[PDB]
């Protein structure tokens, strides 16, 4: 998956090599890399399948971004920075932690100024620490004037046309992601459509279609890690997660200037290449198109995912306590549906 | 369970003996037998627990009913009569049979005149056949005038006061049940409140509270045998139904003049005593009181049964096909809740 590494212009050699990639238990095949002018690319997006677009110019102004530029221009607002002693930055919803007092996150969020993030990064490097940092902060009007100008220069013409053709709802947020080499965001699915715009460095993206729900074992809806896979990709527990032996991914490596369409409900695992330096990415999250007036049968996989989420949500509310959802589901199926 | 057989008045001896009862795998304890004037009886009904009331006079006019009287007076309408070559008359909903083309009922319903039922009964006896008949027909205005007069003479004063004190909805139907000795209605639960009025012969009634759902394994909601237990009480399959080894029943034997309160959602297994002659029973089904305005937590067992039924109903409708309910539930729980 992801094919042979591409050759950089001006005979600069391959951007990356196979050694930089982590080793996993499942096979993959490549995500198509296409021009935004290619009819096959529009067909893939229309059919809610992933595609890497190589020439959108979506974040062209941001390609000059590095830590010095951003530090000097992004202003004095607060940035959410996760810290961990593991390469894995498993996302968790802090509001759901009261449901699950036994959950102890491996990563911690700290709010800091951008120059504080840069200094903490520099200090880790100089002392050779094992601590890892991932900055994950949605962009807003508080950024300095030059970042505002860079944002205004994104290819709104192209992406606004996509939003309109696909019948999507509003752009809800743009997440700025700055990670250290080797950082991993573990497999999960998002409930919005995503154009994932790579700015600096290289990220390996492994996607799984919504019909692999049965192989990826999301946490309960009420758990802080709702929408994230329970499977440890580095040591999969096949006794608890037997259908993870049947997973099949779609993979690619995106670099500066590439844009990956991550369709809504598609699982994705994202890793900053080993020994590849820091990585910078900005995503574009859009609400999905409304539920159709006439529902067509048989349902699509993502529609059954939506039903399952809603059953879990309804039961938590009706039982008055999320902890009772599991026992009630088990009572319903044992000796009656299994 | 059911204690020592009661002694009939006038030194007529015990009504029945232990040999007449079928042998089952679980223990039981007796249902209380009380006067309708006893405050403990009102307390049990108010708390939706079973009680046998010995002196209600609820169906006093009907105590003279036998096959000759009914044949001569019940008129010329049609009566539903089930036939089987087994003692077990497992109920099934004929409308749900299209969902489950693999279901082949062991009993068959035939519509016939009452004199035709009596003749068929007599013919079985004379030839010593093994065929069994169970007449199960809701009473209505079509019955002859003397049965109307007998119905009017039921103790409406007493039962109307019960309906009012308990906040029940309307009387929906009165089912006339006439069975052969040894007939069994297998364990099930009804969604209405029931005063079960015994007229002729003796019936052993074994009840299980709603919190034994986990031990009695009802069929799927969409299956013709919705609300009936899947467990064969005469040969329980503990590999499929392991918690049937934990069932505990409440039992009694009702005879002429007795009235058993079978609370809504309570499982009941009812058998006409072996070698006891034909049995006649008339029940009184009332809709339950409306759902409370303020739901109190933690929920009662019958409220969780109601939730489970509604989840199954909703999923069948949303998926467009009842056969998909099981696979979706299994997908929801495997490796996530079990």
């Amino acid at each position: 998956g992801s094919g042979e590494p591409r050759e950089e212009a001006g005979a600069l050699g391959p951007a990356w090599d196979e050694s930089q990639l982590r080793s996993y238990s499942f096979p993959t095949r490549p995500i198509p890399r296409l021009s935004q002018s290619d009819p096959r690319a529009e067909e893939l997006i229309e059919n809610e399948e992933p595609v890497v677009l190589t020439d959108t110019n979506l974040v062209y102004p941001a390609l000059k971004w590095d830590l010095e530029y951003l530090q000097e221009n992004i202003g004095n607002g607060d940035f959410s920075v996760y810290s961990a002693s593991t390469h894995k930055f498993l996302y968790y919803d802090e509001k759901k932690m009261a449901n699950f007092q036994n959950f102890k996150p491996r990563s911690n969020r700290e709010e800091m100024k951008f120059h504080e993030f840069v200094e903490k990064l520099q200090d880790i490097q100089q002392r050779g620490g094992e601590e890892r940092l991932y900055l994950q902060q949605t962009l807003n009007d508080t950024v300095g004037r030059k970042i505002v100008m860079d944002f205004l220069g994104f290819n709104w013409n192209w992406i606004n046309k996509q939003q309109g053709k696909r019948g999507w709802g509003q752009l809800t947020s743009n997440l700025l992601l700055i990670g250290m080499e080797g950082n991993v965001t573990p497999a999960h699915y998002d409930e919005q459509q995503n154009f994932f715009a790579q700015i600096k460095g290289y990220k390996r993206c492994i996607l799984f279609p919504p019909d692999q729900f049965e192989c990826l074992y999301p946490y309960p809806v009420h758990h802080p890690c709702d929408r994230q896979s329970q499977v440890d990709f580095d040591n999969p527990d096949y006794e608890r997660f037997p259908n993870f032996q049947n997973v099949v991914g779609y993979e690619t490596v995106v670099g500066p200037g590439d844009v990956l369409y991550i369709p809504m409900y598609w699982w994705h695992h994202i890793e900053s290449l080993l020994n590849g330096g820091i990585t910078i990415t900005v995503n574009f999250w859009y609400k999905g198109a409304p539920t159709p007036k006439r529902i067509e049968y048989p349902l699509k996989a993502h529609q059954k995912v939506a039903i399952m989420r809603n059953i879990e949500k309804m039961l938590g509310e009706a039982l008055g306590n999320p902890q009772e959802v599991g026992p009630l589901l088990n009572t319903m199926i044992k000796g009656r549906y299994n | 369970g059911s204690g020592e057989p009661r002694e009939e008045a006038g030194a007529l001896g015990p009504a029945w003996d232990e040999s007449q009862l079928r042998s089952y795998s679980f223990p039981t304890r007796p249902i209380p037998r009380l006067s309708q004037s006893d405050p403990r009886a009102e307390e049990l009904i108010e708390n939706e627990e079973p009680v046998v009331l010995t002196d209600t006079n609820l169906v006093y006019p009907a105590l003279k009913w036998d096959l000759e009287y009914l044949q001569e007076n019940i008129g010329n309408g049609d009566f539903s009569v089930y036939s089987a070559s087994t003692h077990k008359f497992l109920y099934y909903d004929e409308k749900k049979m299209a969902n489950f083309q693999n279901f082949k009922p062991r009993s068959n319903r035939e519509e016939m005149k009452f004199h035709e039922f009596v003749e068929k009964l007599q013919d079985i006896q004379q030839r010593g056949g093994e065929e069994r008949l169970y007449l199960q027909q809701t009473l209505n205005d079509t019955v002859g005038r003397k049965i109307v007069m007998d119905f009017l003479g039921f103790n409406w004063n007493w039962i109307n006061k019960q309906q009012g004190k308990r906040g029940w909805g309307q009387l929906t139907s009165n089912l006339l049940l006439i069975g052969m000795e040894g007939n069994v209605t297998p364990a099930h639960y009804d969604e209405q409140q029931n005063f079960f009025a015994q007229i002729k012969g003796y019936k052993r009634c074994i009840l299980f509270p709603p919190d034994q759902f986990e031990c009695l394994y009802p069929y799927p909601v969409h299956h013709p045998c919705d609300r009936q237990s899947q467990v064969d009480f005469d040969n329980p399959d503990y590999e499929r139904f392991p918690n049937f080894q934990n069932v505990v029943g409440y039992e009694t034997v009702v005879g002429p003049g007795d009235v058993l309160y079978i609370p809504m959602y309570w499982w009941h297994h009812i058998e006409s005593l072996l070698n006891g002659g034909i049995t006649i029973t008339v029940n009184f089904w009332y809709k339950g009181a409306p759902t409370p305005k303020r739901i109190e937590y933690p929920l009662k067992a019958h409220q969780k049964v109601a939730i489970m039924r509604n989840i199954e109903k909703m999923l069948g409708e949303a998926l467009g096909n009842p056969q998909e309910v099981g696979p979706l539930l299994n997908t929801m729980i495997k490796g996530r809740y079990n």
């Binding site: 994950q136 962009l139 807003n140 409930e191 999905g288 539920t291 | -």
Partner: peptide
Amino acid sequence: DIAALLIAAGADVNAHAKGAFF
């Protein structure tokens, strides 16, 4: 419609604070 109710999508994503840019 019960089908429409149950197929209704949410909008959750992996971000602690969400906001549009303007």
